[PDB]
Symmetry: C3
Subunit: 189 residues, 3 copies
C-alpha cells in the first residue's frame, strides 16, 4: 500500500516559498499533514503541506530551493504518501543551520540577533518537518536569507535525519564561509 502518483509543479508565488511547505490542492490534502515524497529507490523526502487555491489537483507545488534539494523537475511524476510523526525520537531537540543572504547581491554589514532569528524561526516553522541538508528561504527583518540544515538532534531521554520542529526546539546559526553576515546573540554555533 504505497502512495499515490502525482506530478511535481512549480510554486504559484514567490511569497509562498517562505513557508518551505510542499503546497497542495485542498481537494487532495489539508494543511498541516506531512507527506513522504518518493522520487526514486534512493530518496524519500519529507515535506509538510499547505494548501493554496492555484495548485492543480493531482500535483504538488515546490519552490526552486526544494526542487534543487529534492532533485525534482517540473512535470516529474512522484509517489506521495501521508507521513506520520508519532515517536519522541522524531521531535527536534537541537538543530544547526548555516545562514547567508539569499541574494549574494544585497548584503548589509548590520549585525543580526540570532536569538531573535531563532525565536521567529521556531514561530513560523512550528510543527513543520526539516531534514539534514535541506535548503530553505528565510524571511527576517524584511530581508531574505538562505538556510542549510547542517545537523539535527533529538532530546536525550541523538543524531536524526529528519525531525519535527516543536516549541522547545533549539536553533543555532552560523554564517556560510566567506559570509559578510555579522551574527550576534547566543543562538550561534
Amino acid at each position: 500500500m504505497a502512495g499515490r502518483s502525482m506530478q511535481a509543479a512549480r510554486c504559484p508565488t514567490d511569497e509562498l516559498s517562505l513557508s518551505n511547505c510542499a503546497v497542495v490542492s485542498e481537494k487532495d490534502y489539508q494543511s498541516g499533514q506531512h507527506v513522504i515524497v518518493r522520487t526514486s529507490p534512493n530518496h524519500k523526502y519529507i515535506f509538510t503541506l499547505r494548501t493554496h487555491p492555484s495548485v492543480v489537483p493531482g500535483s504538488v507545488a515546490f519552490s526552486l530551493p526544494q526542487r534543487k534539494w529534492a532533485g525534482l523537475s517540473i512535470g516529474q511524476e512522484i509517489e506521495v504518501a501521508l507521513y506520520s510523526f508519532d515517536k519522541a525520537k522524531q521531535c527536534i531537540g537541537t538543530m544547526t543551520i548555516e545562514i547567508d543572504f539569499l541574494q549574494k547581491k544585497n548584503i548589509d554589514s548590520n549585525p543580526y540577533d540570532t536569538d531573535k532569528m531563532a525565536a521567529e524561526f521556531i514561530q513560523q516553522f512550528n510543527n513543520q518537518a526539516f531534514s539534514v541538508g535541506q535548503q530553505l528561504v528565510f524571511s527576517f527583518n524584511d530581508k531574505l536569507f538562505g538556510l542549510l540544515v547542517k545537523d539535527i538532534e533529538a532530546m536525550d531521554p541523538q543524531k536524526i535525519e529528519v525531525g519535527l520542529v516543536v516549541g522547545n526546539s533549539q536553533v543555532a546559526f552560523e554564517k556560510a564561509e566567506n559570509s559578510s553576515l555579522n551574527l550576534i546573540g547566543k543562538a550561534k554555533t
Copy 2:
C-alpha cells in the same frame, strides 16, 4: 426569494488560477466544489464550478478573460447567481470531445502528445467540475499551455447533453484545431 443572487463579474486574481477553469469566489459567499448557474440575461445561462480565493471581493465572482468571452461577460457586469445541483444520472459525462491547440502562437513545437496521458490528467484535475459544449478552457500539460474547446458531450446509456459533470470514468477524446501543428498520438482521439 427563489431566483439567484445579484453579484458582479470581476477579473481573475492571477493567471495561475485560470488553469482551474472554475469561477472563483469569496469564502464568505460560497465553498469550493459547489456549482452555480450564472444568468447573464434571458436565454443565456452558464454553469460554473466554484473555487474560493482570498483576494475575491465578497459579492463578486472572478472569471478569466476566456471565461468572460464565452459567457459574454464584461468586468463589473451585474449577474444573477444561484447554486446549481447535479443530481441526475443523465448529467454525468460519459464521453466528451475536445478540440486542442497550443494556447500561444509563440510556443508551437512539433513534439508528440499522448492524448491518453492528457486525457488522464484532464480527468484528474477537472474531476467533479462542470463543462458545457462550446466552452473554452486553458489546459496546462507538460509545462505547456493549451487552448481547449468542448465540441461534444454525451451521457452514459444504461445521449447528447449540453452540460455535464466530469467523473472518474468520463472519456475524453482530443482532436487538434484546423491548421494546428499538434502532433497528437495515442488512442484518445476523435
Copy 3:
C-alpha cells in the same frame, strides 16, 4: 489577559489590499475574527482578519496604507489580541467617507454613482471594522479609489471611533478637495 506578540509583515499581493483586512495564517486565526493591534502602550488599532496561505505563521500582513495609518514598519513587534464586537453602540449607523482616485495617472472625468458605490461598499465590507481616520483602497467599476473615513455614528436607541459595518449601515461620500472626481448619485454629503 494579554495578546500575543507577533511581527508586522508586507501584504502578499496587491489584490489582497482591496479587502482592507489584516491578513493572517490559518494556523493563527480564522477569517472573520477581529483583532486589536497594540502598536504601543497608548495605541490600539482594530482590524478584521482574512487568511491567506502565504502569510508566515506568527506574522500579520498589512498593506502600505494600513502600515502608514497605524505607524507600523515591517518586522515591527506588535501585540495582537482577539477583539469582540458585542454592544449595539459598536454597530455603524452612518459613516462619512472622503473619496479620491488612488493614483494621479488614473484620473478621469467619468461619473461614479455614490448610491451604487455605497451599496457595493456595504456588500464587500459587511461585518468588517472601520475607524475614523482609516485610509482604504476601494475597487469600483474596475477603478481604484482612495478612501478616508471622516466620521462614524451609531444608531440612536452618536459619534464613535470604531465600528462594525452591518447590512443597514449608511455610507455618504464626498470628494477630496481639488479632486477632479466626478461624483453622481444621492449617497453624497
